[PDB]
Design a protein around this nucleic acid. Structure first.
Ligand SMILES: [Zn+2]
Lengths: 49, 99, 49, 1273, 49, 27, 99, 49, 49
RNA sequence: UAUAUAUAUAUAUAUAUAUAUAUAUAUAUAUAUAUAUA
């Protein structure tokens, strides 16, 4: 059904639509905390070994 | 997988609508003097388990983690092996599988 | 002596009969089918924490 | 249970029957009904002695503190006002006073009393102030007590009777016995304690007794005194007790409600006190549920199809809930608690909040809790003095913060002024919008079509009406001698009567009469001030036509009237469900008082100017609806003034603007008050019926659109808000109807808008409305309120309090109704308990008890004889109430969704078939010659032994008396007829069309010998229908009543052993149920509160079928061929006849005659007749030809697909070949499917596949007989 | 299989092949972008083979 | 509180009743 | 345009009457055992709005002032671009546009 | 499309082509005269391009 | 009837190097937007003037 | 006597909510001091 019943807006511009969609997702340091955790993990692992 | 799927479904511009398919189906002319109506059968088969239509996004999300988990066709959807090709409901199931 | 005792007997004893004079075993049977379908739902759509 | 022992023997039997112990029978049915009508009502209270209550409730003596009434009333300017006690000018309701001193004693019942004849005489004759004040107080106090469908004590008796014994379990695995039990209900204990004050020798004198003429009171001894508020408190307590039992709530919540009522009753003005703290419960529960951390659950996934104008929605799965989706708006605890502190009820809030905190996740329990707590608000129909009501509501004028400067107008055009182009702002937007619509209306040959003209004139006439006296005066004043038809016994104030008088007169002569007084009426409400009904006279209603037409065009061609087409009200159900889903943010808005805020100084002047200018495009000399063009002076140019012609439409505007500027002049004549009629004008728009919704909805949409696109972007601050506020438009973001409106935001990307921006947005909207004097009264609580429907996270919440079990509105001092009407009240009462999802098993038990009491009644001649009668209980089965237990069956196997009428009978018999046949064979000798459906076993005698036929035919009998004719009055009947026809047939072409059609029709029907006497809908009978309606609106004479009782009894006593021909044939079909259908949705997800595994049957029915009406291929038959019809005739009759003719294979000219009989011209008649075909017709469309319809109870379910591809009329491997419909299946199969699905819906439990298995006669024989019957009727 | 039904079956199958669905285009051109962006958002990076 | 008619098992919350009812009751 | 159209309709020998067309259409024989009757589809279209076909006179009047105003076909009176030629209502719509 | 329906559709189209309508003659021969006369009557003379 | 901006610009001319008037940042059309979005087009026109 | 299931109670751990106390920050009110103006 999903394959055969796919439709969109009449005059969609993908670049514009995704521009609005992704706007709130890159407003904070969220992606960077995992980087910091990875570093601490590295130090902890080496020291433990 | 669930996290990605729900997140994915939020941003997409694609929308699903079973109605368009049903109209294409029902507009087929047929005789009323036949004992069996293929139209009714396929319509009955076409409706999912629930009115769910969520498995599609589940398949998309799985690709990002195929190393962890693999989607598989539901075992219950397979046509019964004892049947023969002339058994229409079995035939339709085979068509949906290959699609 | 009581409709209660009769009803309990019907549910318990004639649990799988198909006589038209009895209704309740059939409905209970339908409910059992209802539950089996319910299993088919979540078996391909479980619940996450 | 010693209480069961306390009941008299017949009632004990009835309780056993209701509990399911024994099959019900007419014998015990009468014994119970009879004994209730003979014993004094106080005994019901006496029953309460045998309940060992164990609840922590204390009734403070503070209740019995009657405040003197004399200081609560005064007369000034010769009108009896309310003089509120507190400084609040709204304390205009019934005070808390001791009525005692104003009582005499009755000769029939010496204990109770009524008003002093001396007081009413002096108030009438002497117009003495204190006499009048006492009278007014007595009248309204009695009226407030009368706002019940019947005496509350009877309802309490019902509750005790059903609750006296636990119901027997059925065999169903989901049949949970009741968890709640008596001796734990605070309400009943409260009733006990308070009633202890009203006993002198263990007699329990009722504080009041309701009668057809109001209510009487008991004279207190010298020691005691009765405060009227106590009676009201009892009703609320009884109503709460019933509701709590049916909703099956915890005693703690009921405890809070009791304390709620007690605190209100303790203070003065019980009504006012309740009204002030009304919204406390919904705010505590509905507005704030999931403002915590442990949030989660499952929620519906609803999608709105692309052509959003169509309002089509699709269920497309479920969505997991998580914290990111939890509601964003602030809770409502702080304001509510602050309010409760005023009445020192903070404990209630603490209890509610603590209990609420036990539901962190959205599931059945959470919504069930919400349903129960919200069911605690008082269900009393509040009533106040109409004089105070009219004085308090219409005394308001809107406050405009930036009025249109006088220099913004052009020179006058006789009455109107056009708007200068240089003026901008919202007013300019409003002006252009109306002007554009007026232009479109201007050139439109849709009007001047004689048929359409007939529709408009006919639309103006109804059985009700008003202002006839003003009409007769104004025209008599101008020398116009109107006709009279009094001998034709029809009310003068009926809009029909005045219309007949007007028929002959040239219209322009009547123009002076439009500036005449308009009478008024009041209709009380449950949770707000009473509504207003302001019926214009027929002439005024005619003049205002352009205003309506333009408004309609604005609605139908911009935002598609925002559902104001009202085609089926259920289209708002999926809308609010979608609006409440987690991904969407919704805001509830509504004009504070749209009727009171629309006015001429700002609004109507702009509209009048725009319409008058918008009509300039068009022939200046073109009369409209008999209004000719005229010459008016144009003064736009100070240097070159002149006069020019203007079309009739503009002339209408000229007068219409004059009327609006003058303001409406109402005349109040309230009956509850004493000798205080007067008249005063106001700018308040009439807004008495749906005819006003068009104007307010149009203006509502217009202002909202301008706000979104212009005002807000120019004024708001948040850049993010601007980004999301843009790319938004009303056609896909806003809906409304009258004042009510819904605004929903575009889906914030996987996120929610900051409450900060929301506050900024909501604040600016308030200011925007303040500009032109609209108080917007907005709120944001992540819920859906629209047309009094409530949805939370895609689950509908039935607000049961708005349908109190005991309460009923009565707008007059007298009930003015006859006994048999009570039956229809019962039927309507029961359905609400199905629409709202209550405990279906217990609700059914209570319903039957109500039916039993209603089953019996009598009447007495004004001087002469008495009369009496009562129905066999089988009537109510035919009327649509499932039986609890049939002989040989098991109790509680029939679902509430069982259809009424023949369908319900057929389904019941179909299930009951085999037992009846076998049992009849053993019990009775065989009948003398073979039967089509039965063997020789002769079940019909057995059915007669059960009195089935008696009930079946009794329900068919009419229940309102008929007025009698007269011959000199028939000269007036003809005079009434002639004029009604004259008013209807303004032109001649329509009359020629109808006459030709009728002449051809009867000629064909007889000569072709289809049949004779076929009552075919035709225009010539429309005046006849009007006349009958007009005469029916009158109070019948006693002779008609006596005829009714005699006829009813004879119909009961006449021994008949046959149903209608249709039902006889329907019994020939055998239907069986297979397995359960595949589920619609996940059973975990709640869709309607209370439709949960506890309330199994509703939970089954909804889960299997799904609620969202989703007729993707069926369209539920709304495509009727005749889109345009005149009032009076029934479309459902017309299409039924047409299809019936088509099945009968009538020649085309037969269709031509029928179509021409309702005004269709020959060309369009041929065009319409060609469209008729068995193919494009829908299942229900064709099935209705034999009166097989869909029960109203099903209107909330998605039955389309089931009927389409789940009711097998011919399964190859099961059906006997004898039942093969063959070629006639094109019109046979829908009938069988309808019968099948009706039987499937009848039984309890999950929905199963329905299959025809056998027809005793051949399917051909069935079809042949059906064709015969179709030809006969 | 009676040819009338056989004619019907090939008819309905033909209808499905003619539906102008949007999904195939979305899979080839737009879905990869959505994945590529979201890969930087989920708490767990993609893990493929 | 809530109870199952087949085994008399009693439940504090309805969700527990539902999951039990659907899963625990079926020569 | 309105003034000119009124004048045109005021004086004209031509009379618009669809009775002969429908009479010539409904006389076509077809099986009653089919599920679709294109005759009904046609007659559902061509619905006489009762305005006595103001559009026709409106189009004629527009010619006199073509240098000021132009008549265009309404957007709604188009076949949806999502449909196929086999969708009968779409085909009929396209036919009317061509005519 | 089932041929029976196809046979019907070509039939009705054929019927339309055979209707002896008067309009085409009126357009070519009579309507211009009506315009030519009325052009001297309307308060606004014709304005063409 | 204020027109503060116009006079502000003229005044700022005499004090450039101390205060500089700039076009409002939010007056620009959104970057993701396309030329076909008329409200954005007007913004660009006013911005140019 | 033991095992298993269900219910209730008690203890311990973890999470969430509410209340109270203490500390820190911000706002409002009142008092006192100082400055300035009248
Ligand atoms: Zn159990």
């Amino acid at each position: 059904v999903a394959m055969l019943c796919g439709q969109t807006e009449t005059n969609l511009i993908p670049s514009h639509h995704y521009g609005k969609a992704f706007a709130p997702l890159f407003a904070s340091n969220a992606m960077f905390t995992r980087n910091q955790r990875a570093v601490i993990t590295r130090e902890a692992f080496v020291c433990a070994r | 997988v669930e996290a990605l799927s729900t997140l994915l479904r939020s941003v997409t511009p694609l929308v699903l609508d079973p109605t368009v398919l049903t109209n294409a189906i029902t507009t087929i002319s047929e005789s009323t003097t036949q004992t069996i109506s293929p139209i009714s059968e396929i319509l009955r088969l076409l409706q999912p388990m629930g009115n769910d239509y969520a498995a599609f996004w589940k398949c998309i999300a799985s690709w990002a983690y195929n190393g962890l988990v693999t989607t598989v066709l539901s075992e219950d959807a397979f046509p019964d092996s004892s049947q023969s090709i002339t058994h229409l409901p079995s035939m339709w199931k085979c068509l949906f599988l290959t699609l | 002596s009581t409709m209660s005792a009769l009803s309990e007997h019907l549910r318990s004893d004639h649990r799988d009969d198909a006589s038209t004079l009895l209704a309740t075993p059939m409905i209970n049977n339908a409910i059992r089918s209802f539950l089996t379908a319910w299993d088919g739902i979540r078996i391909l759509s479980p619940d996450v924490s | 249970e010693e209480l069961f022992n306390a009941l008299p023997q017949p009632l004990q039997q009835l309780s056993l029957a209701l509990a399911g112990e024994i099959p019900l029978t007419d014998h015990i049915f009468e014994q119970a009904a009879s004994t209730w009508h003979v014993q004094p009502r106080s005994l019901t209270y006496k029953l309460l002695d045998h309940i060992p209550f164990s609840t922590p409730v204390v009734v403070p003596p503070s209740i019995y503190h009657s405040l003197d009434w004399s200081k609560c009333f005064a007369v000034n300017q010769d009108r009896v006002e309310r003089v509120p006690t507190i400084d609040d000018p709204d304390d205009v309701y019934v005070p808390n006073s001791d009525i005692g001193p104003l009582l005499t004693s009755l000769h029939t019942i010496p204990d109770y009393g009524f008003l002093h004849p001396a007081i009413e005489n002096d108030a009438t004759t002497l117009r003495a102030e204190r006499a009048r004040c006492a009278s007014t107080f007595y009248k309204i106090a009695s009226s407030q007590a009368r706002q019940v469908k019947l005496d509350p004590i009877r309802m309490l008796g019902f509750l005790l009777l059903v609750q006296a014994r636990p119901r027997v379990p059925s065999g169903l695995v989901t049949d949970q016995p009741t968890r709640r039990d008596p001796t734990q209900s605070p309400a009943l204990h409260a009733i006990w304690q308070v009633m202890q004050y009203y006993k002198v020798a263990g007699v329990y004198y009722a504080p009041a007794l309701v009668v057809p003429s109001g209510a009487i009171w008991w004279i207190p001894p010298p020691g005691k005194r009765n405060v009227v508020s106590v009676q009201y408190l009892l009703t609320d307590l009884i109503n709460l007790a019933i509701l709590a039992h049916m909703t099956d709530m915890s005693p703690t919540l009921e405890l809070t409600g009791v304390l709620m009522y007690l605190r209100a009753a303790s203070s003065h003005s019980h009504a006012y006190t309740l009204l002030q703290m009304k919204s406390v419960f919904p705010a505590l529960s509905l507005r704030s549920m999931y403002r915590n951390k442990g949030f989660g659950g499952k929620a519906p996934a609803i999608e709105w199809t692309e052509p959003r104008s169509k309002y089509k929605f699709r269920w497309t799965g479920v969505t997991q809930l998580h914290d990111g989706l939890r509601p964003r708006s602030p809770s409502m605890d702080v304001p509510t608690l602050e309010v409760l502190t005023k009445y020192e009820l903070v404990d209630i809030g603490h209890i509610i909040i603590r209990e609420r905190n036990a539901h962190p996740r959205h599931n059945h329990d959470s919504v069930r809790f919400v349903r129960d707590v919200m069911a605690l608000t008082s269900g009393m129909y509040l009533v106040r003095q109409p004089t105070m009501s009219v004085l308090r509501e219409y005394s308001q004028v809107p406050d405009i913060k930036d009025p249109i400067p006088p220099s913004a107008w052009t020179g006058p055009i006789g009455n109107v002024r056009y708007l200068l182009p240089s003026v901008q702002g919202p007013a300019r937007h409003l002006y252009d919008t109306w002007r554009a619509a007026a232009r479109q209306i201007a050139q439109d040959p849709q009007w001047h079509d004689p048929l359409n003209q007939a529709i408009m004139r006919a639309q103006y006439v109804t059985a009700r009406g008003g202002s006839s006296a003003s009409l007769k005066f104004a025209l008599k004043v101008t020398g116009i001698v109107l006709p009279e038809y009094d001998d034709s016994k029809v009310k003068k104030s009926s809009k029909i009567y005045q219309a007949a008088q007007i028929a002959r007169i040239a219209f322009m002569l009547l123009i002076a009469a439009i500036h005449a007084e308009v009478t008024m009426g009041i209709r009380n409400q449950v949770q707000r001030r009473a509504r207003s009904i302001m019926p214009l006279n027929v002439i005024q209603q005619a003049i205002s036509a352009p205003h309506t037409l333009v408004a309609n065009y604005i609605n139908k061609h911009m935002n598609l009237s925002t559902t104001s087409g009202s085609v089926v009200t259920d289209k708002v159900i999926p809308l609010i469900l979608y609006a409440s889903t987690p991904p969407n943010t919704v805001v509830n808005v509504d004009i504070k008082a749209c009727d009171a805020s629309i006015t001429y100084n700002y609004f109507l002047s702009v509209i009048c100017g725009a319409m008058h200018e918008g009509f300039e495009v068009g022939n200046a000399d073109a009369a409209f609806m008999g209004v000719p063009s005229t010459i008016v002076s144009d003064r736009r140019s100070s240097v070159a003034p002149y006069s020019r012609p203007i079309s009739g439409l503009q002339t209408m505007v000229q007068h219409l603007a004059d009327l609006y500027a003058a303001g409406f002049r109402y005349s109040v004549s309230d009956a509850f008050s004493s000798g205080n009629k007067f008249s005063f004008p106001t700018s308040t728009f009439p807004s008495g019926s749906t005819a006003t919704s068009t104007e307010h909805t149009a203006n509502n949409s217009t202002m909202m659109e301008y706000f979104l696109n212009v005002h807000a972007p120019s004024h708001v601050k948040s850049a993010s808000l601007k980004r999301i506020l843009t790319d938004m438009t009303i056609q896909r973001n806003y809906v409304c109807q009258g004042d009510d409106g819904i605004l929903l935001l575009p889906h914030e990307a996987a996120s929610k808008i900051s409450a900060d921006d929301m506050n900024e947005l909501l604040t600016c909207l308030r200011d925007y409305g303040q500009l032109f004097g609209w108080n917007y009264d907005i709120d944001w609580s992540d819920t859906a309120e629209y047309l009094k429907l409530y949805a939370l996270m895609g689950c509908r919440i039935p607000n049961t309090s708005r349908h109190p079990p005991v309460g009923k509105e009565y707008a007059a001092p007298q009930t003015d109704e006859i006994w048999p009407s009570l039956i229809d009240i019962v039927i309507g009462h029961h359905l609400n308990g199905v629409t709202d999802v209550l405990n279906w098993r217990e609700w059914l038990r209570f319903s039957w008890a109500f039916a039993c009491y209603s089953s019996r009644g009598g009447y007495t001649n004004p001087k002469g004889q008495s009369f009496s009668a009562q129905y066999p209980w089988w009537t109510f089965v035919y009327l649509g109430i499932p039986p609890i237990l049939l002989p040989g069956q098991t109790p509680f196997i029939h679902s509430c969704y069982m259809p009424p009428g023949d369908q319900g009978m057929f389904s019941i018999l179909n299930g009951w078939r085999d037992w009846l046949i076998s049992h009849a064979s053993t019990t009775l000798p065989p009948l003398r010659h073979n039967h089509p459906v039965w063997g020789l076993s002769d079940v019909p005698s057995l059915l007669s032994q059960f009195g089935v036929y008696a009930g079946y035919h009794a329900a068919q009998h009419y229940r309102r008396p008929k007025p009698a004719p007269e011959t000199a009055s028939s000269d007036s009947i003809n005079q009434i007829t002639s004029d009604l026809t004259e008013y209807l047939f303004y032109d001649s072409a329509l009359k020629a069309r109808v006459m030709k059609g009728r002449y051809n029709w009867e000629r064909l029907s007889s000569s072709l010998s289809l049949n004779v006497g076929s009552r075919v809908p035709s225009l010539f009978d429309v005046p006849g229908k009007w006349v009958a309606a007009g005469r029916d609106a009158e109070k019948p004479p006693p002779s008609s009543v006596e005829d009714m009782f005699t006829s009813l009894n004879r119909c009961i006593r006449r021994p008949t052993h046959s149903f209608s021909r249709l039902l006889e044939l329907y019994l020939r079909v055998h239907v069986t149920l297979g397995e359960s259908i595949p589920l619609a949705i996940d059973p975990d997800v709640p869709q309607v509160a209370g439709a949960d595994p506890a309330n199994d049957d509703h939970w089954f029915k909804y889960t299997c079928l799904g609620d969202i009406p989703s007729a993707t291929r069926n369209y539920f038959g709304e495509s009727l061929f005749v889109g345009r019809v005149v009032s009076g005739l029934d479309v459902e009759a017309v299409d039924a006849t047409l299809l019936r003719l088509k099945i009968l294979g009538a020649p085309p000219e037969a269709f031509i005659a029928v179509l021409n009989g309702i005004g269709m011209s020959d060309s369009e008649a041929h065009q319409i007749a060609g469209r008729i075909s068995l193919a494009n017709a829908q299942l229900v469309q064709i099935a209705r030809v034999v009166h097989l319809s869909i029960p109203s109870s099903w209107m909330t379910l998605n039955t389309g697909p089931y009927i389409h591809h789940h009711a097998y009329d011919f399964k190859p491997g099961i059906t006997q070949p004898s039942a093969k419909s063959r070629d006639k299946s094109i019109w046979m199969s829908p009938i069988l499917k309808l019968l099948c699905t009706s039987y499937a819906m009848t039984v309890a439990g999950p929905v199963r596949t329905s299959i025809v298995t056998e027809i005793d006669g051949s399917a051909a024989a069935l079809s042949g007989n059906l064709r015969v019957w179709m030809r006969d009727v | 299989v009676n040819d009338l039904t056989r004619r019907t079956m090939t008819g309905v199958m033909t209808a499905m092949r003619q539906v102008k669905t949007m999904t195939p285009f979305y899979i080839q051109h737009m879905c990869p972008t959505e994945l590529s962006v979201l890969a930087s958002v989920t708490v767990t990076p993609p893990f493929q083979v | 509180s809530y109870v199952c008619n087949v085994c008399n098992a009693r439940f504090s919350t309805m969700s527990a009743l539902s999951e039990h009812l659907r899963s625990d009751h079926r020569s």
